[PDB]
């Protein structure tokens, strides 16, 4: 109880983004500024994170686990949707075709990346994935910097790779190349004097399809 | 199967009938030769209509025969000379002398 900061107060920021976003109703605004915050109030929130030690196998939220720190504190506000954060997946995505609307969904999945469980992907809203098999070889460079992951949810199911263990080797053919191309950018950027955020993420994406069968081939 | 490239075996199909083996052998790589402790003789053809995954993992029998004597063994080649028809040849062993 009475759980304040000593800093300046997350919240209450938080809620002030609670006072923009939630009255938007038709308005003609575009927040591409302003949810900036979305995906920067949980990264300051992670720069605090490291104090901790944390565990690495934390499938769960913090809320649940962790009321220690602010990240267990934010992360149970933007979940407890009911049926109004949960229209933006209807939104967002199905009649998204431009790069500033598409930045209100990419930017902002990866926001609700311990949120995104099992079933947002798995509905019969399925396209979302032949999007993103259009937005990662047909993409922009800050869209596919923020694109590679977002069917990092998709892996981890068992039934989407079954479903899609060939289209997604197709796939797998683009992001190797590119994966290359990042050993031949950064070290020859840095064999000068004698960007990771990417690879950092595209990894993620390509860590849980790294134990199927029949996948193998194309790796080596 | 065995593919080279992933380096483990593969199930491309399987039949299900449940006869107890008693000699078998490949004659083209299509057409597959086996025996039976009944005394029998049939050949198992590898599915074609490639159509779905449920039908292309199941065999068929094609052909029938009661070969009226135990077999033990098959091996090649024939006991003709070479002059350089049909093509191939399997004999087989048994338990009564009958090559």
Known sequence: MTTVVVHVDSKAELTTLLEQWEKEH??????VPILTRMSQLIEKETEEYRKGDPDP???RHPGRADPECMLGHLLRILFK???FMNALVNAYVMTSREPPLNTAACRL?????????????????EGIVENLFKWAREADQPLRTYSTGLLGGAMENQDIAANYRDENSQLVAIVLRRLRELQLQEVA????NKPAIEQRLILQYLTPLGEYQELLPIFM | ???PMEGN????????NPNWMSAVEILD???FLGAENAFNLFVCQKDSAATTDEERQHLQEVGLFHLGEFVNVFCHGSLVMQNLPTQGSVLFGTVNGMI
């Open chain 1, 26 to 31: 038709g308005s003609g605004q575009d927040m």
């Open chain 1, 189 to 192: 950027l840095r064999q000068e």
């Open chain 2, 1 to 3: 199967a065995y593919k």
């Open chain 1, 57 to 59: 196998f934390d499938d």
């Open chain 1, 109 to 125: 999945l990866l926001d609700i990346m311990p949120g995104l469980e099992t079933a947002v992907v798995f509905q019969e809203k």
């Open chain 2, 29 to 31: 790589d299509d057409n």
């Open chain 2, 9 to 16: 075996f593969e199930e491309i199909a399987r039949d299900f």
């Open chain 1, 81 to 83: 949707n009911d049926d």
